Symmetry: C6
Subunit: 286 residues, 6 copies
DNA sequence: GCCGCCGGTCGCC
DNA sequence: GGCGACCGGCGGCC
């Protein structure tokens, strides 16, 4: 399709450059814009025609960073020295395979398996790793911030949805089957792609509370849409916060490795994530 | 009736050209506009006025594509077409089916405004319906609408799709009007006349929809009335588990070939419309498909 | 009343010319404007000013076509070969006397009797003649469109009100009497602001008697006296052959033009005291051409 | 005090002239403006600024004609030929005193006695006289048009209030005392930021005694003392000819103008202390123009 | 806190001059503006951008007159012929102390004794005196105008709150205690910046003791001690002449002009220990002009 | 981060200068602006354009004062024996050095979990006077008594200090109380502002009785007593004061905090390693000769 | 105050 | 006389 013949003025080209600048520096919120470049914000807020451009540029930047650009490219920029590499080795999970899956999972290339699940005892580092990814993607949203009876508001536009210490109520289970499966909401269909979801919890989430009693009616359907990871070993208190770079170096290194190994397991996506294969451990990871 | 003797400035001519450019490339949604041409959208959205124009152009393009141009214009060797292969296995005449579709999609079938596909599951009922629905500019599903108000925003659509639907006794009164091509009161009260918009309808189902659900029971009072407005097809043959997603290109090829052939056979059946679509006539098969 | 001494730029003259064109070409809805002239609509819809001018011009054209010009001028333009003339003769009715009645009724000059009633067996063409007149006037409103509990909405700014198969309920019989009698609605008395507001002609086609107002689950005849004061009745008893086809506004314009061309004293004799029932064909009084 | 030493631009002076012209020709509604001058109305409504100017100018003209200018100026321009003059002789009322009393009453000069009451048998012309006077003043409202539960809404901005065949209810008896006595509502107090501003003349017509306020399904005389002080009572005892016809503003203006030139000193002989019942004709008090 | 430089253009300078002219001639309401300078109001309403300036200027003028100017300056410009001086002597109170106290009171300088209370039999002129003071401040409000369940709304933006024929109920005792004592309401606290001060003076007229709180169908005295500390009580016992007439600004300002010129020693001696009652005439200290 | 290479007109530079001027003069409300400078306010409100500029300037100035500039810089300034606050602290048996130094960290949200100060003691001992003295120095603060009874924590965001005077905690709102008193932002704060974490507002509480006991109907419950103790710091005002010490002023606060900033921080670092619910009292020998 | 458009008039055909 | 493109004016925008 041939684009239109419209030629813009100086102001329009300046606005387009401003949108590119906002998209490049990951400035998607007013607070972030004030914290980063207060001078330009003060200059723009002087009048109506300046204030409107702020909202327009923010919306266009969000759309460009979410829909028109692959999210994985936002994450890609001594492999053994990375904290995350050691952490997955302790949990007997191959750092390479889990890294490759995240790239496909964030890129909606895993089919119906749109949801990741971290399972283990409390204080094993589940939320620390999960929250590290949420700070690496352009925009993220948490279920906890939403209303108690409307947990899935403002799902469209997010690069990732995080559900920390969550549990599924039978009154809203039908909505969970859609989003966790990646099916678009009916509102999205009417007005016009799914959003990856990550869930961390202490118990078994496949059990659904129904009244004052637990039930297993929906246990079968939720299993196909999810991948389970076991974080059993307690973490030392000195680990601290995981930096966005630690994710960046880990994902970038895993990207360049041979991909054919991941495709073999990708033929039949199992609900359970396979453990470390000692015969396939990379030499640099040792 | 003479067009007004006004003259357009250089600014309005650009808007008029953009309106034609919208219809030329079948872009009718803001998402499609963003996906196809981002630079022009970004340039337009940097000024109060620069926006009033996006919505105005979209509205004008929708109206022009839906009402001022025949729908079939958007649709217009043959043995290799998957659509023909589909209807061949289903014991129906591939040529005669398309010739009715063109008259049906153009609101030229009188009271029989509704088409119905029926059969066991995994027989291609839904795949064929979406292939037609993708080709038309604008289409809407009854599934997306509210349960208590299934017929909202029917106007402005070139087609309406109803997937695995069931008719309830509460909505049987509104269903009869929309399925029969009769204009709704909302359009009548707005437009000014008593008959204007026109909406084709296509329905798929695994069960007989002529039966109406009332309470926890099923009645047959409205069966005769719904039979007049509808046309039935029986997809009773299991399809080969190899066929893929039917595309608009497949439909356009099927309709283009069927359009130019002889139209002498169709109008004989058009004198009296049978409730069931006629099946394969062995002697009347076109020599191309023998 | 000397007009104002104001003056306006070329844009205002263009707007006035556009309003005059809308009045001339009989365009009164946005969809009609889109159908007749898409180019001018697309040019006008390029900015806020044009989109406001569209609504202003539409409203002004509607007002001019409704209140600034007598409705009869929108109807004027072998007489025996006219389909409508045959129909009234078949129904044993004089075409001239009916036509001359319409030209005074459509202009609200008949006073209290603002309503015509078409009554008789079904499928005799009662709706066909009623709708034919409606399609000729600038704009008409139908009671069937309006909501269940509020039938008399959107009456203002209309030329003709059509009500087919109508039944008067006791709940709304009081509001019904106002419009059917030519009395103005009370909201127009204040929104316009004095008792100078006019009313709208009403035409009713029914298969049964409408003087029997429905109350609950029982028929009552207390209101029959008041309704008969305001109404004129016709009887479509003789069913027509199913080959008359859809009547056209050209037939109405042709028939109405001929009626005004003849003598008017013939109708004036019956105008001294209007009768509820319409007198039938008189062989002596028939027009020389129609014989 | 000396007003602001401003300098009106070219456009603003046009607005001032338009506002003056609207007041001059008594054009107070959009529907009146369309009939009087459609040209200027279209030229103005050609754009947003013109519509805003129309909306502002209408309110300014209403304010100028209501508050800043006395109403009597629009009433003031042999006498035996006047219809109204003969009418009051039938009801044994002196036309001169009635004319003089109305002129002082319309401008809120009577103080407490702010209400005039017409009473008598039906068909004596009680409504005919009230309507003619009402349509002479620029803007008037009717209690009938207003909401049943809120009959005294939209009081401000009216030069006269007309109440036909009214009956006072116990639910609204308290609000009626203020309006009939010229007491402004709290809206005219707190939003107009004072204790009292308008005078809102009110006229009432009835066939029975309105001082008997209905209480539930019973009649009570508690409020008889309070209301009878606020009103002035006129009795239309004699039924007039059926062919009196509709009165017009021309008859109203001529009658008031003639009463203006006559002697005034006779009026205040009684006006120092009004009585509830209007005094009748005495042969001595009859002017020679009517003898 | 040196002012910003901000060199303004002629458009803003003219608006500032208009704002000053508003305060100078006491034009604080739209109705007063229309009644005083109609030409300027007509010119200003010719456009939307000109109509916005009226609402911009009125608020600033009201704020300037309320907070940026001492209220007593609006009061201060033979003596033995002033009606108030004569009236206060009839009640056996010293006019000089009353006038001196009022000026100190209106500027909120009495401390916690913010509210004045006038009590006595009817027809003693209590209400007439209260109106004269309220008519002289820029803007005044009433508790009578407010809603029954929320009588203490719209407190801000007023220089004096008048409560005529007042009485205190138990459902509003907590609100009345704060307002009568000068304590700012929580609205000012959450709109301005923490415990401010503006408050408002209050004047009360009553025919009965207001210290008796009405609860249910029983009179109670729980808050009698708390209320008395906040008011200064005056007993208006002597009936006044029926034909005294209303009081005006010229009477109050003339009276207040004399009082300010005298020494503050007489007042400041009693001001050290504020009493609930006000001292009467002392022949040992009556001013020579009033002897 | 390289700032966007745009350049503003004369009006934009003037507006930025006005925003700076509003910050420098501690003007944050319409009433304060009208009181300080009526002429500029009139000039701005003369037109529709300036009425929007006023609101934008105020909204930007509040944000600049609250989030961009540390609050403690508004306390420090650009006869120590005679300072009124020093005497008042000595009357109530507390070291003026440690009280001032702790404030400079509590007001800057640097104390970690212990985000609140608690004043306890009999009436008329000077609890209210000192509490309001700190508030008058910070740019903008909000007091709880203004809000609705059922909604106590409205408009908490965008304030430098939260004042709660003689208040008592109820079980119906004890769940929200542990949030602000703990320094973790409310749920709506993250959503409207994208980040799971945005620092909280310091809180100062005065009380005549022990607030660690929560009202539960017509009954006192102590289930939440433990949870409040690691969020709070307690000071006891056990000595009454004579009516010879009027309202405290910002001048006293600035002088007091200025001296506490210049002295060594070793006496604070010893206690700051492990915070205690009880604030240690006067040490007889540790008192520096500048206050002996 | 900002960026847009309609419009007049002089400049050139 | 006609066609051209230039700059200044004005728009509405809460
Ligand atoms: N705010 C923090 N500052 C420093 N270290 C932290 C912080 N939060 C967590 N950690 C460290 O991160 C590791 C685990 O963090 P945490 O988020 O509590 O893990 P978890 O297993 O997801 N916990 P839980 O929420 O109990 O399931 C430990 O080494 C902690 O010391
Ligand atoms: N992604 C796909 N979408 C549609 N059809 C598919 C797809 N993949 C394979 N097919 C095959 O294509 C044919 C179309 O089947 P489908 O249209 O889903 O059946 P149907 O009869 O309309 N189903 P039902 O919804 O039960 O009425 C079948 O043979 C499918 O097995
Ligand atoms: N599509 C049509 N359907 C029916 N009648 C038609 C049609 N087109 C033309 N006509 C003519 O219209 C005549 C009847 O018109 P119609 O208005 O339906 O009658 P009616 O007496 O008003 N009907 P009803 O509503 O049953 O009382 C027929 O006899 C035909 O001559
Ligand atoms: N066109 C006319 N309209 C009204 N009244 C007319 C007309 N022509 C003559 N009249 C007479 O003029 C008088 C007007 O009376 P009118 O004001 O309608 O009633 P009223 O005396 O107030 N009584 P009522 O309405 O019965 O309570 C009556 O005597 C009518 O007969
Ligand atoms: N029109 C008037 N306006 C004001 N004061 C008047 C007026 N006429 C007389 N007066 C004087 O005011 C006195 C009563 O006025 P008013 O202000 O109502 O007094 P009051 O003692 O406060 N009344 P009350 O409300 O009965 O307790 C009369 O006795 C006259 O001296
Ligand atoms: N504006 C003032 N007026 C009077 N006394 C004041 C004022 N400001 C301070 N004081 C005095 O300064 C001291 C401060 O006491 P304060 O801080 O109010 O004590 P408290 O125990 O918190 N009060 P309370 O509110 O009764 O619980 C007291 O002696 C007050 O009387
Ligand atoms: Mg956690
Ligand atoms: Mg299907
Ligand atoms: Mg009184």
């Amino acid at each position: 399709v041939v684009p239109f013949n419209g030629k813009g003025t100086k102001a329009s080209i300046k606005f387009q450059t401003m949108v590119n600048w906002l998209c490049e520096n990951r400035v998607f919120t007013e607070d972030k814009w004030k914290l980063v470049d207060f001078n330009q914000y003060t200059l723009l807020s002087s009048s109506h025609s300046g204030s409107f451009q702020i909202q327009s540029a923010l919306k266009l930047a969000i759309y460009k960073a979410t829909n028109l650009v692959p999210t994985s490219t936002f994450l890609l920029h001594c492999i053994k020295d990375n904290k995350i590499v050691k952490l997955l080795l302790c949990q007997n999970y191959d750092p390479l395979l889990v890294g490759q899956h995240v790239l496909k999972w964030i890129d909606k290339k895993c089919g119906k398996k749109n949801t990741l699940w971290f399972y283990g005892p409390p204080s094993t580092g589940k939320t620390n790793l999960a929250m590290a990814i949420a700070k690496s993607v352009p925009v993220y949203g948490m279920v906890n911030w939403n209303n108690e009876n409307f947990p899935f508001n403002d799902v469209a536009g997010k690069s990732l949805v995080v559900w920390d210490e969550g549990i599924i109520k039978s009154t809203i289970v039908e909505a969970a089957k859609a989003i966790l499966g990646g099916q678009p909401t009916r509102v999205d269909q009417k007005m016009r792609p799914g959003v990856p979801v990550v869930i961390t919890s202490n118990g078994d989430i496949t059990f659904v509370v129904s009244g004052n009693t637990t039930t297993t009616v929906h246990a079968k359907a939720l299993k196909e849409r999810m991948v389970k990871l076991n974080f059993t070993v307690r973490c030392s208190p000195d680990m601290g916060l995981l930096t966005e770079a630690d994710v960046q170096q880990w994902l970038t290194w895993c990207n360049a490795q041979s991909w054919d190994h991941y495709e073999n397991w990708a033929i039949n996506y199992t609900f359970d994530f396979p453990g470390i294969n000692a015969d396939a451990l990379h030499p640099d990871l040792q």
